[PDB]
Write a protein that binds this ligand. Structure first.
Ligand SMILES: *[C@@H]1O[C@H](CO[C@@H]2O[C@@H](C)[C@@H](O)[C@@H](O)[C@@H]2O)[C@@H](O[C@@H]2O[C@H](CO)[C@@H](O[C@@H]3O[C@H](CO[C@H]4O[C@H](CO)[C@@H](O)[C@H](O)[C@@H]4O)[C@@H](O)[C@H](O[C@H]4O[C@H](CO)[C@@H](O)[C@H](O)[C@@H]4O)[C@@H]3O)[C@H](O)[C@H]2NC(C)=O)[C@H](O)[C@H]1NC(C)=O
Ligand SMILES: CCCCCCCCCCCCCCCCCCCCCCCCCC(=O)N[C@@H](CO[C@H]1O[C@H](CO)[C@H](O)[C@H](O)[C@H]1O)[C@H](O)[C@H](O)CCCC(=O)Nc1ccc(CCCCC)cc1
Ligand SMILES: *[C@@H]1O[C@H](CO)[C@@H](O)[C@H](O)[C@H]1NC(C)=O
Ligand SMILES: *[C@@H]1O[C@H](CO)[C@@H](O)[C@H](O)[C@H]1NC(C)=O
Ligand code: NA
Ligand code: NA
Lengths: 98, 263
């Protein structure tokens, strides 16, 4: 059993008030069953698109989630992952730069 | 060099529940998906049929349709025979294809670990694989018709199909997408973010004038959802001495005009 790594980053340079895309890349996990949500101010974002799950040379799974977002200095964004390898859901906050 | 990979992931939860899902990659571009819920293989490019006629494609697809049902039954039968010693839940992964210059491969993993390959004219367990696999592999190897089909698929069908993809997909495979870069920081750490480049080869370096800063740490290549790449390169610097630094990006799409971003 392998624990997911989570990276959160934007498609375009983050500029407050300009629409952009936020990515959540989840990697290095096994087994493949996983639950991934993206959060705006701690609340689940509805329209989140998911890539097909695939796996690497080392057999560990990966998947990309993304969503439209507009950064501002009043909103937080995060990616939350539930997986059997972890007792509780793991949440990674967008660091506002990536 | 292009590597063509067909990736199958099969999850067996209990005797009543299982699914098999596949994806196919040509290098870093996805060309097919085959969901458990679909009877047919889905194209993810307009050129995913390669140079095969509709007839040729239906036949090849048929061979995979028969395979998917046969595989699922074989694993279920195997678990019943081995129970309770080997039992659910079970994950099986297969990675098969060819690398073009060609050489082909077919590797199988059980519970996340490489255990079996097809090589030459037969299936084999790899050294270190659980010994309970030896008997089922021996039995599979008695199936001459399956061996002949697999040898054909790996030695012949795969490189032929991929040569057709390379010609049919030429304009996508040789696409050039330009990076956009930006700088950030929170004794400091400066981060140069580079996003939207294709293809993957890229050069990103912190500079002071013409001097490459050797403390530059390049991150992992991360995918964007639009078949482009993201990378960041970081440099830990002394506070006050940030002025004069710049991030330089070289990429094939830029036509010799590098991005230079001054801090
Ligand atoms: C498909 O290509 C196969 C080779 O390619 C590899 O495997 C495929 C699946 C891809 O992944 C590809 O990328 C790989 O590179 C090819 O397999 C070859 O098949 C021949 C027979 O058809 C085998 O020849 C027999 O070899 C043994 C000795 O094998 C050992 O030693 C050699 C080196 O000396 C090693 O390379 C092997 O790994 C083994 O350690 C001989 O004892 C045997 O001789 C006997 O049989 C012949 C008749 O065939 C008689 O004339 C003799 O008198 C003997 O009685 C064979 O010569 C070869 O080993 C095998 N390669 C490998 C690597 O195992 C396969 O045939 C292709 N199939 C089709 C349909 O195209
Ligand atoms: C591959 C090259 C790609 C070419 C590229 C072209 C483009 C295609 C696009 C692809 C999109 C979909 C990708 C899906 C990924 C799958 C790739 C891997 C396929 C490789 C296996 C193909 C097998 C084809 C033959 C087959 O179907 N055999 C049938 C039926 O056999 C009967 O019928 C035959 C003719 O129809 C013959 O006449 C034969 O003689 C008959 O018996 C068999 O039932 C077999 O057993 C069935 C099971 C075989 C098996 O994989 N078993 C297995 C492997 C490893 C393990 C060990 C692990 C276990 C741990 C517990 C265990 C089991
Ligand atoms: C089999 O596994 C599936 C998927 O987890 C589950 O929904 C179902 O309840 C299980 N069935 C039995 C009979 O245990
Ligand atoms: C996957 O597809 C097979 C064949 O149609 C079906 O029997 C099986 O129930 C499917 N599994 C799930 C979990 O939907
Ligand atoms: Na192989
Ligand atoms: Na596996």
């Amino acid at each position: 059993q392998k624990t997911p790594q989570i990276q959160v980053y934007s498609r375009h340079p983050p500029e407050n008030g300009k629409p952009n895309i936020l990515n959540c890349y989840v990697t290095q996990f096994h087994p493949p069953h996983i639950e991934i949500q993206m959060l705006k101010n701690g609340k689940k974002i509805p329209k989140v698109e998911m890539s097909d799950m695939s796996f690497s040379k080392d057999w560990s799974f990966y998947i990309l989630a993304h969503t439209e977002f507009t950064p501002t200095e009043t909103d937080t964004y995060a990616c939350r992952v539930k997986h059997a390898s972890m007792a509780e859901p793991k949440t990674v906050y967008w660091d506002r730069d990536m | 060099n292009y590597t063509f990979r067909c990736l199958q992931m099969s999850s067996f939860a209990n005797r009543s529940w299982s699914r098999t899902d596949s994806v196919v990659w040509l290098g870093d571009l996805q060309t097919h998906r085959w969901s458990n819920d679909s009877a047919t293989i889905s194209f993810t490019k307009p050129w995913s049929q390669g140079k095969l006629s509709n007839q040729q494609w239906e036949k090849l697809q048929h061979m995979f349709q028969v395979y998917r049902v046969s595989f699922t039954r074989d694993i279920q039968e195997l678990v019943k025979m081995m129970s309770p010693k080997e039992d659910y839940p079970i994950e099986i992964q297969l990675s098969a294809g060819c690398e073009m210059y060609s050489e082909s491969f077919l590797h199988v993993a059980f519970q996340g670990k490489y255990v079996v390959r097809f090589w030459g004219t037969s299936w084999q367990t790899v050294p270190g694989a659980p010994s309970w696999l030896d008997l089922p592999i021996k039995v599979l190897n008695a199936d001459q018709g399956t061996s002949a089909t697999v040898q054909m698929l790996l030695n012949d069908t795969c490189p032929l199909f991929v040569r057709g993809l390379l010609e049919a997909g030429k304009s996508d495979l040789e696409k050039q997408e330009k990076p956009v870069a930006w700088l950030s920081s929170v004794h400091r750490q400066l981060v140069c973010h580079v996003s939207g480049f294709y293809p993957k080869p890229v050069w990103v370096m912190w500079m002071r004038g013409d001097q490459e800063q050797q403390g530059t740490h390049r991150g992992d290549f991360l995918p964007n959802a639009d078949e482009t790449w993201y990378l960041q390169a970081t440099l830990d610097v002394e506070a006050g001495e940030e002025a004069g630094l710049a991030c330089r990006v070289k990429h094939s799409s830029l036509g010799g005009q590098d991005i230079i971003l001054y801090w």
